[PDB]
Amino acid sequence: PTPGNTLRQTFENQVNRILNDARDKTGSSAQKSLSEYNNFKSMVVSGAK
Amino acid sequence: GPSSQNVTEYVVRVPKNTTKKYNIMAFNAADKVNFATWNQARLERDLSNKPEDQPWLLRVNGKSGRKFKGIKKGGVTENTSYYIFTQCPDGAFEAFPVHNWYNFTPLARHRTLTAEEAEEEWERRNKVLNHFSIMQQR
Amino acid sequence: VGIRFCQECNNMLYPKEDKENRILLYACRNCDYQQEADNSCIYVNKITHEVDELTQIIADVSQDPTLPRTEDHPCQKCGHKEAVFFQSHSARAEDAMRLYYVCTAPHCGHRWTE
Ligand SMILES: [Zn+2]
């Protein structure tokens, strides 16, 4: 157990950390896969919406 | 031996009606009741209501022995029928339906706290002192 | 560690110390019924609450449909290479995620926790 944390609490924290790292990595891969003509990328690099 | 393959075959007989009505007891095994004490018995009516639809009363050995109060079961015997099989020298089982089932509980025989003086120890709702010697004042 | 009740009025028993023989004396103070206790223990409280849950688990939980069903970790008294694993899920009784294995044979029921 993590010091100062419940065993369930640190298990949930580890699972949340692993899944958040996974979602960050898959988002980075999806963003790197975007082309220059992709309008989804253009709308978010412009900052319009 | 003979008991290793013993086969018993008896006859079931139901007479139509008996002049004496039959019923059934209800004693808890945790009460630890004995039948050697059963030397003299009484079974009368309750007088708290003041008869057939009124709870029962029973006395053992007068006031010396323990006391029971009988209450009829809440369920109705519209879909149930209970039979008592009695052994007899003719060897044929007798099947007799019971009329009612009554539940009995023991009663203490001591100086119980009456209700008119029961209100004085309610001001000591949490302030009560010496639970172990409440009977000593009585 | 354990309690029992009175005999002739069938009431709850309270403790009493004896002035002469210096032996603990369980007694019903609705009566005069006095007896000694061989346990010599009146009160125990496991505040950290490490009770043994092996007696807590019903032996018939293994025949549940919606519980899991593993293939390894066989039983001890019988081989029967099929078992059910679950957690206690009891509030306030510790926080362990440790698993409670029960054998799923119809006449078995030896449960173990590893
Ligand atoms: Zn008593």
Ligand SMILES: [Zn+2]
């Ligand atoms: Zn087994």
